From Swiss-Prot:
ADP-ribosyl glutamic acid: residues carrying this PTM: E56, E134, E135, E169, E274
Keyword Iron-sulfur: no
Enzyme Commission number, as recorded: 2.4.2.-
Coiled-coil residues: none
Region (Disordered): 279-307
Biological source species: Homo sapiens
Function text: Mono-ADP-ribosyltransferase that mediates mono-ADP-ribosylation of target proteins and plays a key role in the response to DNA damage. Mediates mono-ADP-ribosylation of glutamate, aspartate or lysine residues on target proteins. In contrast to PARP1 and PARP2, it is not able to mediate poly-ADP-ribosylation. Involved in DNA repair by mediating mono-ADP-ribosylation of a limited number of acceptor proteins involved in chromatin architecture and in DNA metabolism, such as histone H2B, XRCC5 and XRCC6.
Transmembrane segments: none
Top-level taxon: Eukaryota
Similarity section: Belongs to the ARTD/PARP family.
Principal place of residence: nucleus
Name by which UniProt lists this protein: Protein mono-ADP-ribosyltransferase PARP3
Amino acid sequence: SMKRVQPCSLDPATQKLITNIFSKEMFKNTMALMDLDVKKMPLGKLSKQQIARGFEALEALEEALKGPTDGGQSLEELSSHFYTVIPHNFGHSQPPPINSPELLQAKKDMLLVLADIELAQALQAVSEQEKTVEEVPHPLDRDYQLLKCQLQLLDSGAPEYKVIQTYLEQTGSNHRCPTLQHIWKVNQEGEEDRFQAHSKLGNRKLLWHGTNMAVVAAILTSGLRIMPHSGGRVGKGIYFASENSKSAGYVIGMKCGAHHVGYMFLGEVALGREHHINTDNPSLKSPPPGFDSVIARGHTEPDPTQDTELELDGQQVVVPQGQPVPCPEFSSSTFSQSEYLIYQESQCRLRYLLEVH
Ligand SMILES: Cc1nc2c(c(=O)[nH]1)CSCC2
């Protein structure tokens, strides 16, 4: 007969977060923003098979792009097949040909977001145990438990609160300053074991990772990942910034009522011996031999003399506290702001999640 729904155990802020990151409207908004046809590709219709087939179309396009003219299919023809697999919407005009490396990576980045949307759908599937029991958790407790990631809301007087607020305020944009609403301490267990492997590795820094809302659930469940087909200015790794304003550019938020809500992570990254670069290298898949990280160095860096430390699981972790200052050694760099790169998932541990407006 009628199953009982148990009261929610979660505080209001965490309830709102959980509502936001599993929101169907949000997921569909993200798809429409990536030019996808949500009518032809419903959320409940998304499959891993479809996404794999899309990546296979992009791989064929990549091969056609990298040359030469070998008498294969045209770029228009191979685009047309991609759009059969992954329906796009451009006001019912024909979609554009995927005919440049820039556009190709954009379609790769899109499919990676769609893969993390699919993940959140699959995660929500009702299990057979859940159908037999006569009392069920509040839907938000259920969704929270699916993450298998401990979240703890921080209050104003938490040991790290002011340190994190200062990091945000001092390294964020001077005019378009993102407003802190909430901070959660993040404990994704199953990250801990692989992270402990790097315990001898010094040079740890708390670094920003801005993200769109559509991939937050996947990150909470899985950690920050190096996905096949991922890339960027410093190659195939996980990207962090010491400047909030740099990471805030990657925060795709959503309109709530009269405000715009978005999410940013702080990860503890074991950088070890750093290799500094000053020119883009999209082909990097690891640091040079003897290095543990690659730092694309910017014209500016948060004033190192203002750096502080937090103790996280018995380790000292550098947290920038200073406004960006010019670095004369990197004044001719192709990077205005630094991008911090690691090339294995175990060198980072999620530590904090911030809600910003
Ligand atoms: C998704 C994401 N990308 C990057 C950053 C980020 O915070 N998020 C900062 S470095 C440049 C790339």
